[PDB]
Design a protein around this ligand. Sequence first.
Ligand SMILES: [Ca+2]
Ligand SMILES: [Ca+2]
Length: 269
Amino acid sequence: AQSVPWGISRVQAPAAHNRGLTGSGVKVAVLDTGISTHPDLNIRGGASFVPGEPSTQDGNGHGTHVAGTIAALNNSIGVLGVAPSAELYAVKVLGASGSGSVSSIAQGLEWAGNNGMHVANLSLGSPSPSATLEQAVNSATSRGVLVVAASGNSGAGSISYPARYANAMAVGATDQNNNRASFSQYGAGLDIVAPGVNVQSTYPGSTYASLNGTSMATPHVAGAAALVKQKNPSWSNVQIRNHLKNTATSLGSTNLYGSGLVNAEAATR
Ligand SMILES: [Ca+2]
Ligand SMILES: [Ca+2]
């Protein structure tokens, strides 16, 4: 039987699914540790920019988990993604150890802007600014890709890079009570928040795992952008970003929660 992770229900993805919006035709690049084939995922392609890791198979589990939150298939097993029909591209920019260089991440961005991706999910970040990454974020943006990035897990009142760059949409993590997770970075530049605690998703070995992190929050917004894009095919990245924010459920202070909790039902009405 298929289970609906709590976060999926929380962002109200099933209401959009019920209206016929599943992310069909939207190409979503997952810039991460790769994505492993799995019974509950459909991977359309990708490339690897990690030296020594030429395949787009995930040696860590992180990218596979993230990819399941965005598009785990709607069928009778496993879990269910926010946009179960989005077309997932594995753009491996992080090694199996979970970290990667600015160069790898910048090359994955350029790939996503070059190969017509609509949304790029960056469930990664560092405290360190990088002009090279800013330039790649900007370039992908100018090519129509909506870059969505994790705010970071330091707990601090400022946001990690690249989420701190203007053109990256910054996503914080909430818990089951709709409270900012204690690890969730916040502050200037935070756009919105989404479920980031006890998030069950796909894991290599045709299994499922529950993880915590702004890394898990990010993909619920990347999947919600694919629903909006399906609904409004002519909107650009900026229009989508702004609509997800204008329709989020406000939770209080924008400094702590950005615009609030992403809401896929509100955003696709
Ligand atoms: Ca499933
Ligand atoms: Ca930003």
